[PDB]
Amino acid sequence: VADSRLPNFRALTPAQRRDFLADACGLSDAERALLAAPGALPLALADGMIENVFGSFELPLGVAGNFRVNGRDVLVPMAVEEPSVVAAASYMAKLAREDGGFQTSSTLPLMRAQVQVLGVTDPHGARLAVLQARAQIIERANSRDKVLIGLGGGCKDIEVHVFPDTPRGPMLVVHLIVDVRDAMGANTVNTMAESVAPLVEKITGGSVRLRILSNLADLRLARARVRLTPQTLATQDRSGEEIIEGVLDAYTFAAIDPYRAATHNKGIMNGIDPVIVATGNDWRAVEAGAHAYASRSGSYTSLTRWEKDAGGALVGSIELPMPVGLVGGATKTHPLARLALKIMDLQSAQQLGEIAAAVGLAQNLGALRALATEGI
Amino acid sequence: VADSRLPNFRALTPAQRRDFLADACGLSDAERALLAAPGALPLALADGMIENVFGSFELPLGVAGNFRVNGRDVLVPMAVEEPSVVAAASYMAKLAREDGGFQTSSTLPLMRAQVQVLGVTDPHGARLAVLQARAQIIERANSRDKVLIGLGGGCKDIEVHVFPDTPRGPMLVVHLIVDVRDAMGANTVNTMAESVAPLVEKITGGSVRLRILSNLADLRLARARVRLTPQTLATQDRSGEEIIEGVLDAYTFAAIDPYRAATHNKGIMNGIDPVIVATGNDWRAVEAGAHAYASRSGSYTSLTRWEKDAGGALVGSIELPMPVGLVGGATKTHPLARLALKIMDLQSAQQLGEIAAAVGLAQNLGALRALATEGIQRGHMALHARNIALVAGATGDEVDAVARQLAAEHDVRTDRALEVLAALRAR
Numbered sequence: 001v002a003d004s005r006l007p008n009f010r011a012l013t014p015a016q017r018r019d020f021l022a023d024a025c026g027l028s029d030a031e032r033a034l035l036a037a038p039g040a041l042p043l044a045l046a047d048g049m050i051e052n053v054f055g056s057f058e059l060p061l062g063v064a065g066n067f068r069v070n071g072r073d074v075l076v077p078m079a080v081e082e083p084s085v086v087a088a089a090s091y092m093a094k095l096a097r098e099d100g101g102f103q104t105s106s107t108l109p110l111m112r113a114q115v116q117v118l119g120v121t122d123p124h125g126a127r128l129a130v131l132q133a134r135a136q137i138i139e140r141a142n143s144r145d146k147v148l149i150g151l152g153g154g155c156k157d158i159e160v161h162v163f164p165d166t167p168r169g170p171m172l173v174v175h176l177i178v179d180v181r182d183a184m185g186a187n188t189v190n191t192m193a194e195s196v197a198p199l200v201e202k203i204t205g206g207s208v209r210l211r212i213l214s215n216l217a218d219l220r221l222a223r224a225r226v227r228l229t230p231q232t233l234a235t236q237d238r239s240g241e242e243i244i245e246g247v248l249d250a251y252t253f254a255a256i257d258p259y260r261a262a263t264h265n266k267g268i269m270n271g272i273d274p275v276i277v278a279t280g281n282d283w284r285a286v287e288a289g290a291h292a293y294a295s296r297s298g299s300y301t302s303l304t305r306w307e308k309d310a311g312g313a314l315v316g317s318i319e320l321p322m323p324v325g326l327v328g329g330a331t332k333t334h335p336l337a338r339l340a341l342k343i344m345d346l347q348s349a350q351q352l353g354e355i356a357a358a359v360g361l362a363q364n365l366g367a368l369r370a371l372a373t374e375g376i
Numbered sequence: 377v378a379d380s381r382l383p384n385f386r387a388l389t390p391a392q393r394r395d396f397l398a399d400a401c402g403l404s405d406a407e408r409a410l411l412a413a414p415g416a417l418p419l420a421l422a423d424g425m426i427e428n429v430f431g432s433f434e435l436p437l438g439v440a441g442n443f444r445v446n447g448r449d450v451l452v453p454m455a456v457e458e459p460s461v462v463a464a465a466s467y468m469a470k471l472a473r474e475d476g477g478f479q480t481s482s483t484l485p486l487m488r489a490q491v492q493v494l495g496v497t498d499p500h501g502a503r504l505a506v507l508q509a510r511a512q513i514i515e516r517a518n519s520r521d522k523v524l525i526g527l528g529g530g531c532k533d534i535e536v537h538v539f540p541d542t543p544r545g546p547m548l549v550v551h552l553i554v555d556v557r558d559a560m561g562a563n564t565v566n567t568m569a570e571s572v573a574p575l576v577e578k579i580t581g582g583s584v585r586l587r588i589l590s591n592l593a594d595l596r597l598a599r600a601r602v603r604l605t606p607q608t609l610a611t612q613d614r615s616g617e618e619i620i621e622g623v624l625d626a627y628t629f630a631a632i633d634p635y636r637a638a639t640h641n642k643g644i645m646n647g648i649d650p651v652i653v654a655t656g657n658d659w660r661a662v663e664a665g666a667h668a669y670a671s672r673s674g675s676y677t678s679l680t681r682w683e684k685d686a687g688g689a690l691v692g693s694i695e696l697p698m699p700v701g702l703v704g705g706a707t708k709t710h711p712l713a714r715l716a717l718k719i720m721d722l723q724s725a726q727q728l729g730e731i732a733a734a735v736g737l738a739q740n741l742g743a744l745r746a747l748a749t750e751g752i753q754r755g756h757m758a759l760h761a762r763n764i765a766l767v768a769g770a771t772g773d774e775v776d777a778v779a780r781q782l783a784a785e786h787d788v789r790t791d792r793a794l795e796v797l798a799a800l801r802a803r
């Protein structure tokens with residue numbers, strides 16, 4: 001059975017932690033050697049990934065323990081530079097174990113691809129024409145990516161949003177709603193936006209300008225929930241109930257004040273970004289989606305919610321875009337990203353997204369607990 | 377004296393780029409050696425930075441060339457994993473040199489510390505008591521950090537904000553406004569928040585709960601602007617004037633649509649975050665301050681503006697929080713972070729923040745210019761890139777993928793196609 005409980009990792013050396021992980025996760029001896037020596041990313045490989053490469057930049061690579069998601073333990077690799085982050089994630093995950101861990105879910109892996117049409121004098125009418133022709137546009141979008149279609153992904157729907165008065169004239173904006181399966185999906189969806197452009201121009205009689213995914217991936221949401229009783233939260237000097245009221249004080253402060261919410265959401269991303277980096281995923285894309293979603297209400301606010309259930313237990317919840325992949329980009333190119341994803345042992349990118357959402361929620365809890373405990 | 381031009385860098389091997397950087401920057405043999413071998417971050421040193429360390433994780437480390445900020449050349453190290461990001465920064469920086477590079481400025485390095493006060497039944501009245509006690513509170517905040525006060529920083533002002541109707545009761549929130557000089561300032565500012573809490577509790581009669589910085593560092597703004605004439609932007613297949621109009625088409629899209637603005641601002645952070653990472657700074661803090669700032673107006677929108685000047689030259693401008701440091705955190709623990717500061721030859725944190733805003737502005741320009749001028753049908757450069765990918769041995773879906781990277785890298789040649797194809801076949 002997979003077990004995310006780490007035995008006294010603070011008292012082991014880095015080498016002993018590495019051997020424990022290689023043992024528990026069944027890494028090959030060649031994978032173990034890959035972790036034992038610096039330079040897992042060959043310079044010639046890095047050189048083919050970005051430009052003007054002259055070396056490599058190391059981040060500390062840690063692992064958060066105790067995470068249990070939908071009944072299944074998972075080890076969480078974290079590449080980050082900041083103290084306390086990994087420890088807080090682990091400790092809050094240990095508290096969450098007492099109710100059975102985190103409960104998560106997600107939408108389908110739906111990415112938006114935007115197609116900007118300019119010069120349409122009747123954008124409202126043209127919108128209706130595009131929507132009428134949607135089957136044809138979906139067909140055209142799906143003709144090239146045989147691998148994605150064969151997996152059951154591809155363009156599933158289209159939307160059209162009209163901006164009839166702009167300094168550049170009216171804009172008609174087609175959104176292709178694309179299932180990208182286990183990829184983050186940016187390149188996947190950009191190609192479809194480019195492919196549908198002649199057909200969109202013919203239908204609208206306009207000129208297509210930008211063909212590009214939206215990073216506000218609010219149709220690819222990950223959701224996570226945790227519950228903690230006062231018994232679980234009680235310490236020697238503070239009662240579980242007192243800690244709980246202090247956490248709600250801290251949360252509401254983030255809910256109503258963007259100056260606090262920015263900080264509150266930053267602590268969430270302390271949890272999430274290190275998993276994104278360690279698995280070879282684009283962290284700028286996850287950061288953009290999270291913080292943009294945080295202002296969907298008209299005001300920048302908390303991505304999490306903290307409440308009490310009928311019996312007084314603390315309930316935290318999170319919902320946010322989670323565009324991530326088990327394939328594509330660097331996720332299978334960087335040898336340690338391949339290795340980190342093997343440590344986590346996941347079947348879908350949704351699973352990775354749900355685990356990320358849980359890690360963020362625990363990280364947020366760790367901050368709120370600490371900030372409300374600390375004495376004057 | 378400082379030169380940021382990287383001649384023939386596309387054709388050089390990583391080792392040669394390294395040796396060039398060492399000479400151009402006057403690095404010591406100890407510094408050049410640290411670049412020569414992997415493991416610049418010793419495991420035992422990593423072990424002291426975060427918890428539960430079992431190794432280290434490498435990002436590709438590149439350098440963007442051609443950048444010139446307020447008349448000074450500066451090389452920009454960039455740690456990132458995504459193709460074409462480093463290339464777009466360099467190429468737009470190169471076009472930027474024609475008008476003289478970038479012009480930048482910043483505000484004072486002012487950070488906010490929040491002191492949340494609960495249980496006050498007259499929050500409005502108690503706010504006026506706190507504001508009256510301004511000097512006493514400021515002196516309290518400045519009583520411990522003697523090094524910072526001696527440098528010219530310290531708590532300079534306060535603000536009080538009242539939330540009279542919340543499910544947790546009324547909230548009175550004191551902001552300490554602290555000049556943190558060359559540090560990121562989270563610790564400095566947190567400590568002051570703790571320091572004034574008993575005095576704030578005395579004045580208001582309330583209970584202080586959170587004592588914490590605001591990552592919404594809108595008193596610590598970096599600003600950068602750039603100008604490019606039609607002549608500078610002209611290409612063989614497109615006039616400068618129609619590229620300028622295209623960029624304007626793309627910019628307004630981001631200004632009005634949050635679905636486009638998010639991607640537009642993500643591209644800005646493609647330029648900024650890798651500098652943040654390479655200099656040992658907290659990228660989560662920079663991400664938080666940028667994206668929260670982007671919705672200050674009530675709607676999530678662009679962090680940059682793109683316009684034309686009187687004679688029709690494209691003008692781009694950017695303004696955003698930039699909480700970064702040259703001291704503290706990992707910027708002096710990590711040996712490469714220390715070295716990256718030496719390569720940039722930075723005199724202050726403000727200067728690091730202005731450079732990054734310029735890199736972010738340049739990245740945005742590269743993205744907008746590319747997206748707006750991409751042909752509806754494959755043009756002759758795109759077809760040439762496919763042929764180059766084919767001759768280098770690409771097949772199936774690899775052809776378009778390699779050719780896409782080559783074109784976006786402005787490095788459409790067979791030797792590059794070989795390096796990029798080998799990367800893809802490392803999957």
Ligand SMILES: NC(=O)c1ccc[n+]([C@@H]2O[C@H](COP(=O)([O-])OP(=O)(O)OC[C@H]3O[C@@H](n4cnc5c(N)ncnc54)[C@H](O)[C@@H]3O)[C@@H](O)[C@H]2O)c1
Pocket residue numbers: 145146147148151153180181182183184185186187188189213215282285325327328329330458459639642643
């Ligand atoms: N603003 C942005 O976020 C943005 C924009 C452009 C590019 N990027 C970069 O795009 C890259 C990610 O693009 P991508 O995610 O499309 O990956 P990719 O282009 O490397 O791979 C996508 C392809 O993988 C194939 N595939 C095989 N197995 C699959 C599976 N199980 N599920 C889904 N697809 C499968 C599919 O044919 C699909 O087309 C990153 O490097 C990112 O930085 C980001």
Ligand SMILES: NC(=O)c1ccc[n+]([C@@H]2O[C@H](COP(=O)([O-])OP(=O)(O)OC[C@H]3O[C@@H](n4cnc5c(N)ncnc54)[C@H](O)[C@@H]3O)[C@@H](O)[C@H]2O)c1
Pocket residue numbers: 082083263266267521523524527529556557558559560561562563564565589591658661701703704705706
């Ligand atoms: N949400 C957040 O952003 C957050 C929250 C908590 C902690 N952190 C972490 O805090 C750390 C950074 O805080 P910090 O910047 O105060 O670093 P720091 O902890 O090293 O403190 C800076 C100290 O160095 C001294 N100093 C010496 N030279 C100085 C100079 N030229 N200018 C200013 N101060 C000088 C000062 O006395 C100052 O107090 C980061 O690691 C960050 O990840 C971030």
